[PDB]
C-alpha cells in the first residue's frame, strides 16, 4: 500500500487470477493420459506457474485494482518501502552492461584509428584485439571517470560544423 | 529561365559541360587554374535545371550551381 | 414587410453614403 | 476512315457554324436523354419516367452549351470568337430540340 | 585456412555468432531461472 | 467489406490471446507495425536523413566514437526499396495472420 | 619563395563551407603560380561525391 | 498569362502549374513582384480585417441556423434528454428512409445534432429565446460588414497607414494588453454580472430592462465604500436549479471553486470574478511600456540589458529587438507558438473544468470540443516552427545578431538536435518495448509478468491537489497541513468536493496504462520537435548542402548529386513533422476518448486492464467501439449514424489517395501525361479541342502538399466520424 | 420557409457554376 | 434568339434562373424528393443506449 496499492500476497484479485489460470491449464490437462508427455508438459507448466505466483508474493510486489504486479520506479519510495529490486536495482544492473558495451565499442574504435586503413578492420573485426578489450573493459566506470577528469573523453572544437 | 551561376572554385576539368544534356555550358579561358579554363553558361534560356552539371563537379561545395527559377516551355522539357 | 422595407429604406441612405465613400476616398 | 471522317459535321468545313452546331446539337439531343429516361432515379414511375429524365437531360445540354461558350472565351472557319459563339448557339438550340425530339419518340 | 578464419571474423558472421551467444546465454538463464520479473535473492 | 469481412472476421485474431492462435494475434499487431514502419521510408527522403545523421555524427565526434565506415543515409532507390519491402512484409503478414487465426478456429 | 606548406605535411582546413571544415588532411602539392586556390589537400574522409581531394587558398589553411 | 498578377514569373509560364502556383503563393506577400515593406504591411493589415470579417460572418451563421432551424427554445427547458440541433437538412439526393432516420430531437424535418456545443455556451451566457439569437446574428452580421468595409478603407490612399505605424511595438502592446485584453474582459464581466448572473437566477435582463434591474440588491455601494465581500454574501446554493430562482442566491462575485451541483459546470459567479481579476491585471500590465508620455519601459533596453555575466548566454539578448520588430516570421512564429499552446490549454481545461452549463453530461459535445482544439493546437504549433524556419532564411541577419542568444542557438545547433534525437530514441525504445513486452505477456496468457509502472510522479501531484484515492496525505489530502488550513473558507471546499467525486473528469484516477501513454505523448512531442527544430536550425545549411539559404525555404531538392538530396529543404523538413504531429495528437485523443468512454459507460476497470498493452487499444477501443458506426447503413436498413458511417469510409478514401501523391512521385506521372498529350493530339474529332495551359505533372513540392492535405483531411474525417458516432451511438 | 429548397440549388449548382466559369475565364486571359 | 457570346451567357443564366426558382416549389416531385413531403411516423428518439 504505497499509491492506492496493496501487496499481492494480500490482494484477492491476484489470487483470483492465479486460480483463473490454473483452471484453464487443468481443463486443458483433462484431455490426456496421466503418463502422456502432453500432460507431463502441462503439469510442468503449472509448477512453473504456481511457483511464479509464489515468488511474486514472496518479493512483496504491489497489486492494485486489477490484481497485477505494479512497479514503483522512484527511489525514496522503493528504498523506503523495500522495492529497489523492481526498478532501482535493475536501473544500475542495466547501466553497468550498457556502458560496458559502449566502452568496449569505444575502445575498439579508438584503438583502430592508428592504422593503415581502419575501415577494413570494421568489416574484419580483429578478434584477438576485440576480445582483449572485451575482457579488460570490466572495470569501465573505474576507467571512464578517470578519463572524464582529464579532458580526453571529450574531443574539443575540432568537431565538424556547418555555419556557426 | 533558370539561374546558373558558377564560381571561382572552378578548376576547369570541363566535366560539367560534358554532363550537360542541353549545351548550357561551355569553356572560356581563365588564368586561375592549371588547365587555363573556366566554364560559362551563355544558354541558360535552354536549361531545364536537371543538375547533371553539379553531379559532376569534383570540387567540394560545387563550383557550378543551378538555381531553379521561373519555368518556360523550354525549362519544363516539353515536346508539346 | 415592415422590417424588410425599413431595412431597405435604410439601405437606400446607406448606399447613398456609400456613393460619398466611393468618391471622397479617391 | 478517311471516307467517313469527311462526312460528320466536325470536319465539314464547307458548312456554316450555325447549321454545324444544330446537327451536333440534335445528334447529342435524343441520345443523352437515354440513360436518364431508362435508368435514372425514376425508372419505376410509369408516368414521370419520360418527363423528369428528359427535363434533366435538357439541363445537361444547358450545362454543355455553357461549357462550349466557356471554351470559346478561353481559347480565342469555326475556330473564332464569332464562329464558336454561333457553334455553341446552334448546340443549345439544336440540343433542346433533340431532347424534345427524344420525348416525342415515346 | 587463415583466409577462412578471416571470413569467420567478418562483420555478419561475428554478428550471427555473438547473437547466438547472447541469445543462447539468455535462453539458458531463462530456462534455469523461470520468469524473472523482479530481482530476488 | 468493412463490416462483414474485415470487422466481423477479425474477431478471431484479436481475442485469440491465451490460446495457440495468440501468435497470430501478435503478428497481426506485428505486421500492422512493419507496414506503417515502411511509410517512414515511402514518404520521406534522403536529404533529410543525411542531415540528421550529421547532427548525431556530431555527438559521436564529440565523444570520440566517430566510426571509420562513415554513416550515410540510405540511397534514393534504396530507401524506396526498403520502403516497399517493409510495405509488402507488413502488408502480407497482416493478412497471413488474419486469415489463419480466422480459419483455424472457425474451420 | 615557395608559398604554402611543404609537400606532405598535415594540415587543418578552415573553409566553413567545405565538407572537411575543422578536419585534418595531408597537403599533396602547392601550386606556385597566381592561382586563387593552389593548395591541394587529400583526405581519408571522402565527401558525399566520393571525391577525396580539393583545392584551397593560402588563408583557409592552417598547419597541424 | 494574366492570372498570377502578383508573380510575373508565373505569368510567363505556359504550363498548368501556373494555376496551382497562382493559388498557393498568393498569400506569400514577401515574394510578390514590386512588393515594398510599406506595401507589405498594408496588405497584411487589410487581410486581418478579412479574417475577422469571416469569423464574425461565420459566428453570425451559427447564431442564425440555431435560431431558425434549431431547437434552442426547446432545449432550454430540458437540457439533458433533448439533443441539440445544428442546422436542418435539404439534400434532394435523399430517400424516404433517409429522411425519417435523420428526423430526431423532436424536430419536423431532417436535422443535424450539433456536437460543437454552442448551445451550452449560449445557454450560460444568458441566451434563452430564439429572438435573442437572431439579434446576435444580425449584430455580428453588421459587425462583419464593418470589418469588410474597414479593410477596404485602410487600403485607400487617404487612409493607408505609415510604415512607422506598424513598427510601433510599444503602442500596440500597450493598447492590446489594456484595451483588447483588459477592457474587453472588464466589459465581459459587465455581461456576466448584469446579464448572465441574473439570467440563471430566473430574471430576464434584456436590452429593455437592463437600466432598471440592479445586479446586486445594494449595488455600487460596496465598491465605493470598500466591503467587497458584500458581493459574495448569499451565493447560488448547493440546491440551486439553473435557469430558475429555486434556491437562487444574490451574490455576484463569489469565489467558491469546484462545480455547480446540477450542471456540473463552473459557477457563474467565480467566472465573473475571474474575468474581473485578469481585467485588472491586464490593464495594470497595460501600463508598462513607454509609448509617448515619458514613463514606461522601452523594449530596446530590456532585451539588450539582460546579458548574464561569465558568458552564460553569449552576448545576452542584445540586438533581438530589431530582429523581432523588423521580421514578421519571427512575430508570426511566436504568436503561433503562444496561441498553439493556449489552444491546448483551452482543451486541457475544458474537459476537466467544464465552464458551460450541462456540459460534461452531453458527451459528444465534450468529445468534439476537446479533439477540435487539440488538432487546432497541433497545426498551429507546427506552424510556429514552420514560420520559425522561414525566419532563419528570409529574415535572419548574422551581422545584426552577433553573439546573442539567437545565434548561440545556431552555434550549438547540433547539440540541440542530437539531444532531441536521444530523448526521442530513448522514449520510442522504452515505450514500444514495454507495450510489446505487455502484448507478449497477454499472448502467453500471463498478465502478471507485465511491466506496470505506477505513475508515482503524477499521483503525487493529484494527492497534492487533494485526491485521497492514493493516500500520499501530502498537502491537500493532508488535513493538518498548511495549504489545506489556509483556505477552508477561501476556495478549497468546493474544489476538494469536486476532485474526490469519482465521476467527473477533474484529475482522473490513473494507473500504469496512463504511465505508458504519457510517455508515448512525450515520445510524440519530442519527436515532432526533433523534426521541426532540425527544420529550423538546418534551414540555412548542413554539411550536405551548405547554401540552403540561397535557394529559399520551399525548394524540391538539390539534385541526385552528393548521394541524393530528396526532402532536403526546410519545407520538406517541416512536412515530415505533420505526419508525426497527427500521430501525436492522434495519441492524445485516442487516450482522451477511451479513458472517457470507460468513464462514462461505468466500466472504469475495462480501460486499466486493457490500456496496458496495445491489443486492448485495438480490440477494445477501435474494434469494440466501431460496432454501431459501421452499421450506419447495411442491407437491413440505415439509421442516424449513416452520415458518420459514410464519412468514415470517405475519410479512409482521402487518406489512401494521399499515399498516391506520397509513394508515387513526379516523373512517373509526367511520362504518363506525355502519352495523354499524344493521344489527345492524334485523336480525330478531339483535335477540335486544345488546351491553353499545357498539362504538366504536379511539381515535387506540390506533390508533398497535395499528398499531405489528402493525408490530413482523410485523417481528420476518419477520426471525427469515429469520435462522433461512437460517443453519440451509445449515448 | 421555402428558403432551403432554393438557396441550396443556388449555392451548390448555380452560384458555384458561375464561380466555375468566371474564375476560369479569368485564368487564361492574355495579359495586355 | 441568341447568336453571340453574351446573348448565350444571358440565356444559360436565365434558364438556370427559370428552373431553380421553380424547383423549390413547383418541380419538387412527389416521388423524387422525400424531403418535400409531410412529417411521417416517428424518428425523434434519443441517441440510444445511454446519455
Ligand atoms: C522527477 C523527479 C522526481 C519526482 C517528482 C519525485 C517525487 C517524490 N520523491 Mg523522489 N527522487 C528522485 C526523483 C523524483 N522523485 C531521484 C532522482 C532521487 C534520487 C535517487 C529521489 C530520491 C528521493 C528520496 C530519498 C525521497 C524521495 C521522496 C519523494 C516524494 C516526495 C515524491 C513522491 C521522499 C519520500 O518518500 O517522501 C517524503 C524521499 O524520502 N525521493
Ligand atoms: C481568410 C481568407 C482570405 C483573405 C482575407 C484573402 C485576402 C486576399 N486574397 Mg486570397 N485566397 C483565399 C483566402 C483569403 N484571401 C483562399 C482560400 C484562396 C484559394 C487558395 C485565395 C486565393 C487568392 C488568389 C489567387 C489571390 C488572392 C488575393 C487576395 C488579396 C485580394 C487579399 C489580400 C490576390 C492577391 O493577393 O493578389 C495581389 C490573388 O491574386 N487570394
Ligand atoms: C485599445 C485599442 C485597441 C484595440 C481594442 C485593438 C483591437 C484589435 N487590434 Mg489593434 N492596434 C491598436 C489599438 C487597438 N487595437 C493600436 C494603437 C495599434 C497601432 C500601434 C494597433 C495595431 C494593430 C495591428 C497592426 C493589428 C491590430 C489588430 C487588432 C485586432 C486583434 C485581432 C483579434 O480580434 O484578436 C483578438 C484576440 C482575442 C480576443 C483572443 C485572446 C484573448 C484571450 C487571452 C484568449 C483566451 C480567452 C478567450 C477570449 C475566451 C474565448 C471564449 C469565447 C469568446 C469563445 C483587434 C480588433 C490586428 C487585426 O486583426 O487587424 C484589425 C492587426 O493586424 N491592431
Ligand atoms: C465583452 C463584452 C460583451 C460581449 C461580448 C457581450 C455579448 C453579448 N451580449 Mg452583452 N453586455 C455587456 C458586454 C458584452 N456583451 C455589458 C457590459 C452589458 C451591460 C450594459 C451588456 C448587456 C447586455 C444585455 C442587456 C443583453 C446583452 C446581450 C448580449 C448577446 C447578444 C448581443 C446583442 O444583443 O447585440 C445587440 C447589441 C446592441 C443592441 C447594442 C450593442 C452596443 C454596442 C454596439 C457594442 C459596441 C461593441 C463594438 C461594436 C464591437 C467592437 C468592434 C468594433 C471596434 C451577446 C451574448 C443580449 C442577450 O441576448 O443576452 C441575453 C441582451 O439582451 N448584453
Ligand atoms: C465595462 C463593463 C460595465 C458596464 C458598461 C457597466 C454598466 C453599468 N453598471 Mg455595472 N458592473 C460591472 C461592469 C460594467 N457595468 C462590473 C464588472 C461589476 C462588478 C464589480 C458591476 C457591478 C454593478 C452594480 C453592482 C451596479 C452596476 C450598475 C451599472 C449601470 C449604471 C452605472 C452608473 C450601468 C448599466 C448599477 C445599476 O444601475 O445597475 C443597472 C448597479 O447597481 N454595475
Ligand atoms: C496566423 C496564421 C498563419 C499565417 C498568416 C500564415 C501565413 C503564411 N504562411 Mg503559414 N502556416 C500556418 C499559419 C499561418 N501561416 C500554420 C498553422 C502552419 C502549419 C500547418 C503553416 C505552415 C506554412 C508553410 C509550410 C508555409 C507557410 C507559408 C506561408 C506564407 C504563404 C501563404 C500561403 O502559402 O498561403 C496559401 C495557402 C493555401 C493555398 C492553402 C493550401 C491548402 C491548405 C492545406 C488547405 C487545404 C484544406 C482542404 C482543402 C480542406 C477541404 C476538404 C474538403 C473535403 C472539405 C504566409 C506568410 C509558406 C511560405 O512562407 O513559404 C516560404 C510555406 O512554405 N505556412
Ligand atoms: C509506425 C511507423 C513509424 C515508426 C516506428 C517510426 C519510428 C521512428 N521515427 Mg518516424 N516517421 C513515420 C513513421 C514511423 N516512424 C512517418 C510516416 C513519417 C513521415 C515520413 C516519419 C518521419 C520521421 C522523421 C522525420 C523522423 C522520424 C524519427 C523516428 C525515430 C524516432 C525515435 C524513436 O522512437 O526510436 C525508437 C525506434 C523504434 C522502437 C523502432 C525500432 C524497432 C526495434 C526496436 C528494432 C529492433 C527489432 C528487431 C530486432 C529488428 C528486426 C529486423 C531483422 C533482425 C529481422 C523512429 C525510428 C526521427 C528520428 O530519426 O529520431 C531519432 C525523425 O527525425 N520519423
Ligand atoms: C449541392 C447541390 C446539388 C443539388 C441541389 C442537386 C440536386 C439533384 N441531384 Mg445532384 N449532384 C451534385 C449536387 C447537387 N445535386 C453534385 C456535386 C454531384 C456530384 C457528386 C451530384 C451528382 C448527382 C447524380 C449522379 C445524380 C444527381 C441527381 C440529382 C437530383 C436528385 C433526384 C431528384 O430530382 C430528380 C429531378 C429531376 C430528374 C427533374 C430534372 C431537374 C433538373 C435538375 C432541372 C435542370 C436544371 C437546369 C435547366 C440546368 C442547371 C442550371 C445550370 C446553370 C447549371 C436533384 C436535381 C440525380 C438526377 O436525376 O439528376 C437530375 C442523379 O442521377 N446528382
Ligand atoms: C524555431 C524558432 C522559433 C520558434 C520557437 C517555438 C515554437 C517555441 C515554442 C516554445 C514553447 C511552446 C515553450 C513553452 C514553454 C512553457 C513553459 C516554459 C512552461 C512553464 C511552466 C511553468 C512555469 C509552470 C509553473 C507552475 C506550475 C509548476 C504548475 C502550477 C502553476 C505554476 C505557475 C506555479 C522562433 C519563432 C522563435 C524563431 C526562432 C527559432
Ligand atoms: C535515480 C533514478 C532515476 C532518476 C534519474 C535521474 C534524475 C537522472 C539524471 C540524469 C542526468 C541529469 C544525466 C545527465 C547526463 C549528462 C551527460 C553529459 C551524460 C553523459 C554520458 C556520457 C558522456 C557517457 C559516455 C560514454 C562513456 C564514457 C562510457 C559508455 C560509452 C559512452 C561513450 C557513451 C529514475 C527514477 C528515473 C529511474 C531510477 C533511477
Ligand atoms: C529512416 C530513413 C533513413 C535512415 C535509415 C538508416 C540510414 C539505416 C537504418 C539502420 C541501419 C540498418 C543500421 C543498423 C545496423 C547496422 C548494421 C549496425 C549494427 C550494430 C548493432 C545493431 C549490431 C534513410 O537513410 C532514408 C533514405 C531515403 C529515404 C528514406 C529514409 C528513411 O526513412
Asked if B2 contacts B75 with a C-beta cutoff of 8 angstroms, the reply is yes
Q: How are the residues of chain F apportioned to helix, strand and coil, as percentages rounded to the nearest 5? A: 75, 0, 25
Which is it for strands A70-71 and H452-453: parallel, antiparallel or unpaired? parallel
Please tell me the distance from the alpha carbon of residue I28 to that of residue H11, in angstroms, as a whole number.
10
Cα H338 to ligand 9 centre (Å): 8
Q: Which residue has the cell 522514449?
A: H427
C-alpha dist (Å) from residue H163 to C22, H36, H160, H166, H325: 25, 10, 9, 6, 12
What kind and span of H or E run contains G54? Answer: strand G53-56
Residue E6: which domain range? Answer: 1-41
Which CATH number do you get for residue E7? 1.20.5.510
Please tell me the distance from the alpha carbon of residue I26 to that of residue H722, in angstroms, as a whole number.
41
Instruction: Tell which J residues from 8 to 47 touch I, by Cβ distance under 8 Å.
Output: 13, 16, 20-21, 23-25, 28, 35-36
Method: cryo-EM
- 3-class DSSP string for A35-66: CCHHHHHHHHHHHHHHHHHHHHHHCCCEECCC
β-strand partners of B38: B28
What radius of gyration, in Å, describes the C-alpha atoms of chain B?
13
Q: How many CB atoms lie within 10 A of CB F99?
A: 13
Rounded (10°) angle between helices H570-601 and H363-390? 160
Q: How many CB atoms lie within 10 A of CB H58?
A: 12
Please give the distance of CA I19 from its chain centroid, rounded to a whole number.
3
- Across the interface, whether the CB atoms of J43 and H113 are under 8 A apart is answered no
- Across the interface, whether the CB atoms of F58 and A106 are under 8 A apart is answered no
If DSSP codes are grouped into helix, strand and coil, which group holds residue G26?
strand
- Across the interface, whether the CB atoms of H153 and C26 are under 8 A apart is answered no
Give one DSSP letter per residue of B16-70, joined into a string: HHHH-TT---EEEE-SSSTT-EEEE-TTTTS------STTT--SSS-SS-EE---
Cα F9 to ligand 4 centre (Å): 58
Q: Which of H10, H18, H25, H27 to mutate to test the pocket of ligand 2 (most atoms within 8 A of CB)?
A: H27
**In sequence order, which ranges of H538-603 are alpha helices (DSSP H)?**
548-551, 570-601
The CATH code that applies to domain H1-731 is 1.20.1130.10
The CATH code that applies to domain B1-80 is 3.30.70.20
Please tell me the distance from the alpha carbon of residue H169 to that of residue H291, in angstroms, as a whole number.
9
C-alpha dist (Å) from residue H315 to F59, H320, H323, H399, H413: 25, 11, 15, 13, 17
Four-CA torsion H311, H317, H319, H322, nearest 10 degrees: 160
If DSSP codes are grouped into helix, strand and coil, which group holds residue H364?
helix
Closest to H159 (Cα-Cα) out of H305, H49, H312: H49
Q: Which residues have a Cβ under 8 Å from the Cβ of A47 and sit 6 or more positions away?
A: none
C-alpha dist (Å) from residue H425 to H83, H523, H532, J39: 46, 8, 16, 61
What kind and span of H or E run contains B75? Answer: none
Sorted by where each begins, the domain ranges of chain H are 1-731
- Across the interface, whether the CB atoms of A154 and F18 are under 8 A apart is answered no
Which is it for strands A6-7 and A62-63: parallel, antiparallel or unpaired? antiparallel
Asked if H611 contacts H442 with a C-beta cutoff of 8 angstroms, the reply is no
Burial readout G23-37 (b: 16 or more C-beta within 10 A, e: otherwise): bebebeebeeeebeb
Which residues form the pocket of ligand 9, taking CB atoms under 6 Å from any ligand atom? H 330, 333-334, 337, 341, 384-385, 388, 391, 536
Q: How many CB atoms lie within 10 A of CB A92?
A: 10
Instruction: List the chains bordering chain I where 3 or more Cβ pairs fall under 8 Å.
Output: D, H, J
| D93 contact residues in J (CB cutoff 8 A) | 1-2
Question: Can you give the length of chain C in residues?
Answer: 26
Sorted by where each begins, the domain ranges of chain G are 1-64
Please tell me the distance from the alpha carbon of residue A52 to that of residue H441, in angstroms, as a whole number.
14
Max Cα–Cα distance, chain I, nearest Å? 49
Fold for G1-64, please state it: SH3 type barrels. (2.30.30)
Cα B32 to ligand 5 centre (Å): 83
Closest partner residue to H15 (CB to CB) among B61, B76, B79 is: B76
Phi, psi of G11 (to 5 degrees): -160, 165
Domains and CATH numbers, chain A: 1-164 (1.10.8.110)
D-J contacts at Cβ under 8 angstroms? 45
Cα D86 to ligand 10 centre (Å): 83
β-strand partners of A7: A62
Closest to F50 (Cα-Cα) out of H422, G48, H413: G48
Q: Which residues have a Cβ under 8 Å from the Cβ of A59 and sit 6 or more positions away?
A: A85, E38, E40
Q: Which residues have a Cβ under 8 Å from the Cβ of H307 and sit 6 or more positions away?
A: H313, H315, H316, H317, H318
C-alpha dist (Å) from residue H393 to H278, H323, H537: 38, 13, 10
CA angle F22, F26, F32 (to 5 degrees): 145
Asked if H612 contacts H516 with a C-beta cutoff of 8 angstroms, the reply is yes
Phi, psi of H302 (to 5 degrees): -100, -40
Amino acid at each position: 500500500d504505497i499509491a492506492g496499492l496493496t501487496p499481492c500476497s494480500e490482494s484477492k484479485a491476484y489470487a483470483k487470477l492465479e486460480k483463473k489460470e490454473l483452471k484453464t491449464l487443468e481443463k486443458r490437462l483433462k484431455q490426456y493420459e496421466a503418463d502422456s508427455a502432453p500432460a507431463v508438459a502441462l503439469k510442468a507448466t503449472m509448477e512453473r506457474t504456481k511457483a511464479r505466483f509464489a515468488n511474486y508474493a514472496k518479493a512483496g510486489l504491489l497489486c492494485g485494482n486489477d490484481g497485477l504486479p505494479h512497479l514503483i520506479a522512484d527511489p525514496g519510495l522503493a528504498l523506503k518501502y523495500g522495492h529497489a529490486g523492481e526498478v532501482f536495482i535493475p536501473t544500475f544492473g542495466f547501466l553497468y552492461v550498457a556502458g560496458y558495451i559502449g566502452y568496449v565499442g569505444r575502445q575498439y574504435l579508438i584503438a583502430v584509428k592508428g592504422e593503415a586503413k581502419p575501415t577494413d578492420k570494421e568489416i574484419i573485426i580483429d578478434v584477438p584485439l576485440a576480445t582483449k578489450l572485451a575482457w579488460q573493459g570490466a572495470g569501465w566506470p573505474l576507467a571512464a571517470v578517470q578519463e572524464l577528469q582529464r579532458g580526453t573523453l571529450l574531443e574539443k572544437e575540432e568537431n565538424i560544423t556547418v555555419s556557426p | 529561365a533558370h539561374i546558373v551561376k558558377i564560381y571561382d572554385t572552378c578548376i576547369g576539368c570541363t566535366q560539367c559541360v560534358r554532363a550537360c544534356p542541353l549545351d548550357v555550358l561551355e569553356m572560356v579561358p581563365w588564368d586561375g587554374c592549371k588547365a587555363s579554363q573556366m566554364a560559362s553558361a551563355p544558354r541558360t534560356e535552354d536549361c531545364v535545371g536537371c543538375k547533371r552539371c553539379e553531379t559532376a563537379c569534383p570540387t567540394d561545395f560545387l563550383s557550378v550551381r543551378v538555381y531553379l527559377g521561373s519555368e518556360s516551355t523550354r525549362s519544363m522539357g516539353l515536346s508539346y | 414587410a415592415a422590417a424588410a422595407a425599413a431595412a431597405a429604406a435604410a439601405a437606400a441612405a446607406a448606399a447613398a453614403a456609400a456613393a460619398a465613400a466611393a468618391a471622397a476616398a479617391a | 476512315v478517311a471516307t467517313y471522317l469527311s462526312n460528320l459535321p466536325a470536319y465539314r468545313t464547307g458548312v456554316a457554324p450555325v447549321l454545324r452546331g444544330v446537327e451536333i446539337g440534335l445528334a447529342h439531343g435524343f441520345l443523352l436523354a437515354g440513360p436518364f429516361i431508362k435508368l435514372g432515379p425514376l425508372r419505376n414511375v410509369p408516368e414521370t419516367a419520360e418527363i423528369a429524365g428528359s427535363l434533366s437531360a435538357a439541363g445537361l445540354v444547358l450545362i454543355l452549351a455553357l461549357c462550349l461558350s466557356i471554351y470559346g472565351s478561353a481559347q480565342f472557319p469555326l475556330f473564332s470568337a464569332d464562329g464558336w459563339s454561333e457553334f455553341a448557339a446552334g448546340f443549345l438550340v439544336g440540343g433542346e430540340a433533340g431532347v424534345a425530339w427524344a420525348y416525342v419518340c415515346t | 585456412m587463415k583466409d577462412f578464419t578471416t571470413y569467420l571474423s567478418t562483420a555478419p558472421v561475428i554478428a550471427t555468432i555473438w547473437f547466438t551467444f547472447t541469445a543462447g546465454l539468455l535462453i539458458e538463464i531463462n530456462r534455469y531461472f523461470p520468469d524473472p520479473l523482479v530481482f530476488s535473492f | 467489406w468493412l463490416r462483414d469481412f474485415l470487422w466481423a472476421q477479425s474477431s478471431q485474431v484479436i481475442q485469440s490471446y491465451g490460446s495457440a492462435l495468440s501468435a497470430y494475434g501478435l503478428i497481426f499487431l506485428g505486421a500492422h507495425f512493419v507496414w506503417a514502419f515502411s511509410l517512414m521510408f515511402l514518404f520521406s527522403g534522403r536529404g533529410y536523413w543525411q542531415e540528421l545523421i550529421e547532427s548525431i555524427v556530431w555527438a559521436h565526434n564529440k565523444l570520440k566514437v566517430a566510426p571509420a565506415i562513415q554513416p550515410r543515409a540510405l540511397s534514393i532507390t534504396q530507401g524506396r526499396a526498403v520502403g516497399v519491402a517493409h510495405y509488402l512484409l507488413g502488408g502480407i503478414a497482416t493478412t497471413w495472420s488474419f486469415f489463419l487465426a480466422r480459419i483455424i478456429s472457425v474451420g | 619563395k615557395e608559398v604554402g606548406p611543404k609537400r606532405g605535411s598535415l594540415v587543418k582546413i578552415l573553409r566553413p563551407e567545405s565538407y572537411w571544415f575543422n578536419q585534418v588532411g595531408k597537403v599533396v602539392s602547392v601550386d606556385q603560380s597566381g592561382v586563387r586556390y593552389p593548395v591541394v589537400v587529400r583526405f581519408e574522409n571522402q565527401n558525399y561525391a566520393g571525391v577525396t581531394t580539393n583545392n584551397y587558398a593560402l588563408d583557409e589553411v592552417v598547419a597541424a | 498569362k494574366l492570372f498570377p498578377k502578383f508573380s510575373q514569373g508565373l505569368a510567363q509560364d505556359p504550363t498548368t502549374r501556373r494555376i496551382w502556383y497562382g493559388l498557393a503563393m498568393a498569400h506569400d506577400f514577401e515574394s510578390h513582384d514590386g512588393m515594398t515593406e510599406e506595401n507589405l504591411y498594408q496588405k497584411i493589415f487589410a487581410s486581418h480585417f478579412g479574417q475577422l470579417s469571416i469569423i464574425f460572418l461565420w459566428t453570425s451563421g451559427n447564431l442564425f441556423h440555431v435560431a431558425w432551424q434549431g431547437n434552442f427554445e426547446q432545449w432550454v427547458t430540458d437540457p439533458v434528454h433533448i439533443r441539440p440541433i445544428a442546422h436542418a437538412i435539404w439534400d434532394p439526393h435523399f430517400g424516404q428512409p433517409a429522411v425519417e432516420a435523420f428526423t430526431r430531437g423532436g424536430a419536423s424535418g431532417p436535422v443535424n445534432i450539433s456536437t460543437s456545443g454552442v448551445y451550452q455556451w449560449w445557454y450560460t451566457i444568458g441566451m434563452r429565446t430564439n429572438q435573442d439569437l437572431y439579434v446576435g446574428s444580425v449584430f455580428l452580421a453588421l459587425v462583419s460588414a464593418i470589418f469588410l468595409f474597414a479593410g477596404w478603407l485602410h487600403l485607400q490612399p487617404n487612409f493607408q497607414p505609415s510604415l512607422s505605424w506598424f513598427k510601433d511595438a510599444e503602442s500596440r502592446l500597450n493598447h492590446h494588453l489594456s484595451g483588447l485584453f483588459g477592457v474587453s474582459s472588464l466589459a465581459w464581466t459587465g455581461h456576466l454580472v448584469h446579464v448572465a448572473i441574473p439570467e440563471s437566477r430566473g430574471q430576464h435582463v434584456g436590452w429593455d430592462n437592463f437600466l432598471s434591474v440592479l445586479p446586486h440588491p445594494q449595488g455600487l455601494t460596496p465598491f465605493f465604500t470598500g466591503n467587497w465581500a458584500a458581493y459574495a454574501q448569499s451565493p447560488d446554493t448547493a440546491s440551486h436549479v439553473f435557469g430558475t430562482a429555486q434556491g437562487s442566491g444574490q451574490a455576484i462575485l463569489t469565489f467558491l471553486g469546484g462545480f455547480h451541483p446540477q450542471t456540473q459546470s463552473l459557477w457563474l459567479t467565480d467566472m465573473a470574478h475571474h474575468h474581473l481579476a485578469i481585467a485588472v491585471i491586464f490593464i495594470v500590465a497595460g501600463h508598462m511600456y513607454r509609448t509617448n508620455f515619458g514613463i514606461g519601459h522601452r523594449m530596446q533596453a530590456i532585451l539588450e540589458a539582460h546579458t548574464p555575466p561569465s558568458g552564460s548566454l553569449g552576448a545576452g539578448h542584445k540586438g533581438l529587438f530589431d530582429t523581432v520588430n523588423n521580421s514578421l516570421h519571427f512575430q508570426l512564429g511566436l504568436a503561433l507558438a503562444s496561441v498553439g499552446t493556449i489552444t491546448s490549454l483551452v482543451a486541457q481545461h475544458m474537459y476537466s473544468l467544464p465552464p458551460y452549463a450541462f456540459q460534461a453530461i452531453d458527451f459528444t459535445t465534450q468529445a468534439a470540443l476537446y479533439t477540435h482544439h487539440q488538432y487546432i493546437a497541433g497545426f498551429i504549433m507546427c506552424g510556429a516552427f514552420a514560420h520559425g524556419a522561414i525566419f532563419f532564411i528570409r529574415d535572419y541577419d548574422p551581422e545584426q545578431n552577433k553573439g546573442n542568444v539567437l545565434a548561440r542557438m545556431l552555434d550549438h545547433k547540433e547539440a540541440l538536435i542530437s539531444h532531441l534525437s536521444w530523448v526521442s530514441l530513448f522514449l520510442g525504445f522504452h515505450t514500444l518495448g514495454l507495450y510489446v513486452h505487455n502484448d507478449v505477456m497477454q499472448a502467453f496468457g500471463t498478465p502478471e509478468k507485465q511491466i506496470l509502472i505506477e505513475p508515482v510522479f503524477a499521483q503525487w501531484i493529484q494527492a497534492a491537489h487533494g485526491k485521497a484515492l492514493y493516500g500520499f496525505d501530502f498537502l491537500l489530502s493532508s488535513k493538518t497541513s498548511a495549504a489545506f488550513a489556509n483556505g477552508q473558507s477561501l476556495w478549497l471546499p468546493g474544489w476538494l468536493d469536486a476532485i474526490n467525486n469519482n465521476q467527473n473528469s477533474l484529475f482522473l484516477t490513473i494507473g500504469p496504462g496512463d504511465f505508458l501513454v504519457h510517455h508515448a505523448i512525450a515520445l510524440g512531442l519530442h519527436t515532432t520537435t526533433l523534426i521541426l527544430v532540425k527544420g529550423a536550425l538546418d534551414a540555412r545549411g548542413s554539411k550536405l548542402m551548405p547554401d540552403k539559404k540561397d535557394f529559399g525555404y520551399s525548394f524540391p531538392c538539390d539534385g541526385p548529386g552528393r548521394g541524393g538530396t530528396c526532402d532536403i529543404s526546410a519545407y520538406d523538413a517541416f512536412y515530415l513533422a505533420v505526419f508525426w504531429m497527427l500521430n501525436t495528437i492522434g495519441w492524445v485523443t485516442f487516450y482522451w476518448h477511451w479513458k472517457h468512454l470507460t468513464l462514462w459507460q461505468g466500466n472504469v476497470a475495462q480501460f486499466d486492464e486493457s490500456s496496458t498493452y496495445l491489443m486492448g487499444w485495438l480490440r477494445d477501443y477501435l474494434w469494440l467501439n466501431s460496432s454501431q458506426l459501421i452499421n450506419g447503413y447495411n442491407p437491413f436498413g440505415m439509421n442516424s449514424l449513416s452520415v458518420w458511417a459514410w464519412t468514415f469510409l470517405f475519410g479512409h478514401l482521402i487518406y489512401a489517395t494521399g499515399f498516391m501523391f506520397l509513394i508515387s512521385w513526379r516523373g512517373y506521372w509526367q511520362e504518363l501525361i506525355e502519352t495523354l498529350v499524344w493521344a489527345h493530339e492524334k485523336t480525330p474529332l478531339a483535335n477540335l479541342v486544345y488546351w491553353k495551359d499545357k498539362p504538366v505533372a504536379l511539381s515535387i513540392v506540390q506533390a508533398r502538399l497535395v499528398g499531405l492535405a489528402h493525408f490530413s483531411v482523410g485523417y481528420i474525417f476518419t477520426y471525427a466520424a469515429f469520435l462522433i458516432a461512437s460517443t453519440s451511438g451509445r449515448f | 420557409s421555402w428558403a432551403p429548397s432554393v438557396f441550396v440549388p443556388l449555392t451548390g449548382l448555380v452560384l458555384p457554376a458561375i464561380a466555375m466559369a468566371t474564375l476560369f475565364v479569368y485564368i487564361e486571359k492574355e495579359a495586355p | 434568339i441568341i447568336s453571340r457570346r453574351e446573348s448565350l451567357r444571358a440565356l444559360v443564366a436565365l434558364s438556370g434562373i427559370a428552373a431553380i426558382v421553380t424547383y423549390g416549389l413547383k418541380g419538387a416531385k412527389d416521388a423524387d424528393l422525400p424531403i418535400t413531403k409531410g412529417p411521417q411516423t416517428t424518428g425523434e428518439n434519443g441517441k440510444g443506449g445511454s446519455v
